[PDB]
């Protein structure tokens, strides 16, 4: 523009924030089952399984 | 309760007799303040016994 007009450069608050900065994408499909990422509800210090030998 | 309010008299005696007066007595009722320490309730123990806090 020009000194005599007043210029206000225009601003943003962004709604998406930064999450991440490592791959974490590796869970049921995206590593093929290798890793599965469940929702359970578990009691105590950890969970036992048995499984006939 | 006036504690001589009845008094011996003699009739054909006239000696004065100490003048009594009436007094009042207060009960009470104290107030007791009461309380509980306090409880540490965290959600952690709960939820890793998979309680509702």
């Known amino acids: 523009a020009l000194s005599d007009l007043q210029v206000f450069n225009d601003w943003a608050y962004k709604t998406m924030s930064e999450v991440l900065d490592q791959q974490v994408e590796l869970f049921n499909g995206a590593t093929r089952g290798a890793i599965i990422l469940r929702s359970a509800g578990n009691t105590g210090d950890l969970s036992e399984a048995a499984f006939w030998a | ?53």
């Not at chain 2, 054909?12 to 540490?40: E, F, H, W």
């Open chain 2, 1 to 53: 309760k006036i504690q001589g309010l009845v008094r011996p008299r003699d009739p054909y005696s006239n000696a004065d007799v100490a003048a009594k007066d009436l007094r009042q007595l207060v009960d009470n009722t104290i107030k007791v303040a009461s309380g509980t320490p306090p409880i540490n309730i965290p959600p952690s123990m709960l939820r890793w016994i998979q309680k509702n806090p």
